[PDB]
Amino acid sequence: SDFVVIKALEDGVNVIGLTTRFHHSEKLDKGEVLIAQFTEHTSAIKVRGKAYIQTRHGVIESEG
Amino acid sequence: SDFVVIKALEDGVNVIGLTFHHSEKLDKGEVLIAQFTEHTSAIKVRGKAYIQTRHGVIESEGK
Amino acid sequence: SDFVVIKALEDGVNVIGLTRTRFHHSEKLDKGEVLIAQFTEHTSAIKVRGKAYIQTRHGVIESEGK
Amino acid sequence: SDFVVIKALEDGVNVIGLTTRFHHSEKLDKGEVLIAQFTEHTSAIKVRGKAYIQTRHGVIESEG
Amino acid sequence: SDFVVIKALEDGVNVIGLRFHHSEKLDKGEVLIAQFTEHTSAIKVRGKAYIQTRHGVIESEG
Amino acid sequence: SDFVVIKALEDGVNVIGLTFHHSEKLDKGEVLIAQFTEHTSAIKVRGKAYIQTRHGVIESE
Amino acid sequence: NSDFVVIKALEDGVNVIGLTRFHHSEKLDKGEVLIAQFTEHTSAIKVRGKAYIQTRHGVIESEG
Amino acid sequence: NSDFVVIKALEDGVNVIGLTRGHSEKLDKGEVLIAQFTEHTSAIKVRGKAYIQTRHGVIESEG
Amino acid sequence: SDFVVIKALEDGVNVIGLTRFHHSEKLDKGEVLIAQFTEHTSAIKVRGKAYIQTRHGVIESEG
Amino acid sequence: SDFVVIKALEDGVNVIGLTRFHHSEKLDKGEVLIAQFTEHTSAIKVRGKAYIQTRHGVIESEG
Amino acid sequence: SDFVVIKALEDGVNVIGLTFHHSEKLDKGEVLIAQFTEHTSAIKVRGKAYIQTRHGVIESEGK
User: Fold this and answer.
1) Chain E interface mutation, best of D26, D35, D41, D45, highest count of E Cβ atoms under 10 Å
2) How far apart are CA I6 and CA I23, in angstroms?
3) CA–CA separation, G59 vs G36, rounded Å?
4) Contact F45 E31 (CB under 8 A)
5) How far apart are CA J47 and CA H28, in angstroms?
6) Residues in chain D whose beta carbon is closer than 8 A to a beta carbon of chain C?
7) E15 FRET partner, CA 20 to 30 A, in D19, I53, I61, K24?
């Protein structure tokens, strides 16, 4: 039941949900925030683009 | 069973629930306490807002 | 099983419960009244319109709404 | 399984349980203490009157 | 599965289980450790008592 | 699944399990570790005793 | 749903009594250590004798 | 369901006894036993000179 | 229900999910993967230069 | 679901799993075993010179 | 549902899953995040590696 907070630091950030071809994409624009939870459908989440990301394990910056 | 607190810092903030499911408009100063359902995998916030989660605070910045 | 504490700072604060789907169970609160609202299955989101002090597991926050 | 502690600071404090009409009211007199637990029947609890309230989220005072 | 500790500071303190009704008299210095059942949604304390809960201590006055 | 520790400070301390459904006498210096069952909603302590719970210590007089 | 007590006997003939009738007695000699867990069978545990007792709630000494 | 004790034998012939509802195991000086509580096993008695760690801190058994 | 955060410090970092070796996933410099353990996936191997966060602290994989 | 970390400080350290029954497992100097408790396995005995980490802190088994 | 983080400090580190069954080779600098399955009671690490567990860090000094 865990989640990640992703804040987009540029336009056209891509938050990709995975299972095994990559199955749910979600575009985010500069300053928008996504709170993404892990479903059963969704094993992994990839972030392409400049974003600030918070997880139970601390913060991290994607420099895609 | 976790939730997010969202306080709108301008009018017309948009709190979008993702499965193309559920939009919810918020006006400046209004507070939404949104919980994750089974229906709702992700929540997107478009607009200037202050957000609290289990993982600390964060600010969404509307263009 | 989590809850929010809402104290109304003016009369006519509105604590709106939202369904699993739009604006549903409304509940008016008057200046100084305190509501302890728990999330049900029926209730996915809670909106607060009006001047209120709110406590959640995630700390305090103040609603400055209409 | 969580609960609230309510101490009445005046007579005729009203502790109202909500399902959604005014299902269960409970009067409290100055100095009396109620330890109220959330049931399935009970989604929300309203406190009308001057009272000192303790929850998992800290203390708060209701002002009648 | 949570409980409250109640110590009576005078005689004839009343610990009421919750319209629903199990009453329990306590005398000065007696201690009750009351747990919440399914039967019991709320507990009222009438009388002067010292009360400990998960949420800290509190004193009932009369 | 929670429990209380009770140490008797005098003879003839009475540890009563409720819904007087089970009484249990304790003598000066004896220690009882009482757990809550489904059978047992409340526990009353009559007598001089030192009591430890999850919520800290307390003395019955 | 699964807690235990540590009991160290400070004299010979310490008695660790399991309750429900007075179900199960267990003698302890000076310096022996018993780690007793609560079963469904066992609601309460009585210690008679001089012993050092550790519980989740801290230490306590039984006196004779 | 699932807690354990660490027992280090400080002499030879330490006895770690498992007790049933209402199993002996010998330990020689310097051997370590990590014993978990089963359903079969309500209580554990230690006879002999040993160093014992539990969730509740350390304790020494004095044969 | 636990997860690892992997940030790629060079191009062509390989995040391999293990059953054999069943699921590979390439990551390019600066991309972030939040990988959760499934039932299908017992182990995860990281090949390449990466910064990794787990419940157990941080660690760097050295390509 | 708990586990012990055992690092062997000499050759031929013996990590014995108990229920009755005994799965033995030899460890050579500097090898590390992360042993989890199964239902099959009530107790674990360590014979030999080893460094042991458990939820309850560290402890050294003395050969 | 617990896991271990293993970083290989030399080539040819061996991460062995037990019930000598599932072996998994690791090369210098590669990282494995291994979870305990039902199939897998114990994990042995042979070779020079840095290991993180819920119980802190430890270094294997191996084959």
Assistant:
1) D35
2) 16
3) 15
4) yes
5) 9
6) 1-2, 4, 18, 20, 38, 42-48, 51, 53, 55-58, 60, 62-64
7) D19
The residues near G40 (Cβ < 8 Å, ≥ 6 apart) are none
The SS3 of residue F49 is strand
> How far is CA D26 from each of CA C57, D14, E23, E36, rounded to the nearest angstrom?
27, 6, 16, 18
Contacts of D48 in chain C (CB under 8 A): 33
Residue J22 and residue J16: Cα distance in Å, rounded?
6
Q: How was this structure determined?
A: X-ray
**Residue type at position B13:** V
Yes or no: say if D6 and D45 are a contact pair by the CB < 8 Å rule. Answer: no
Cα-based angle E4, E8, E11 (whole degrees, multiple of 5): 145
Domains in chain C: ranges and CATH: 1-66 (2.60.40.50)
DSSP D18: E
**Cα angle, residue H34 at apex, residues H32 and H35 outer, rounded to 5°:** 130
Give me F18's structure tokens: 């409720």
Number of neighbours of residue H22 by Cβ within 10 angstroms: 11
A interface test, pick of I32, I37, I60 with most A CB neighbours within 10 Å: I32
* Distance of alpha carbon K25 from alpha carbon K46, whole angstroms: 10
Question: Which of J14, J40, J56, J61 to mutate to probe the H interface, most H CBs <10 Å?
Answer: J56
Q: How far apart are the first and last CA of chain I?
A: 28
| Cα three-residue angle I29-I32-I38, rounded to 5 degrees | 130
What kind and span of H or E run contains C16?
strand C13-19
DSSP string, chain E: --EEEEEESSSSEEEEE----B--EE-TT-EEEEE--SS-SEEEEESSEEEEETTEEEEE--
Give the distance from residue I37's alpha carbon to the nearest chain K alpha carbon, in angstroms: 8
Query: CA dihedral in degrees (F56, F59, G1, G5; nearest 10)?
Result: 100
- Rounded to 5°, angle at Cα K48 from J34 and I20: 65
- The strand pairing partners of B4, in sequence order, are B34
Residue with the two structure tokens 């739009």: C22
Query: What amino acid is encoded at E1 in this protein?
Result: S
**Direct distance between the N- and C-terminal alpha carbons of chain D, in angstroms, rounded to an integer:** 28
This PDB structure is determined at a resolution in Å of 3.2
Q: Residues preceding discontinuities in chain G at C–N > 2.5 Å? A: 20
- The span from the CA of A28 to the CA of F7, in Å, is 62
- Written as six digits, the tokens of E60 are 């009932």
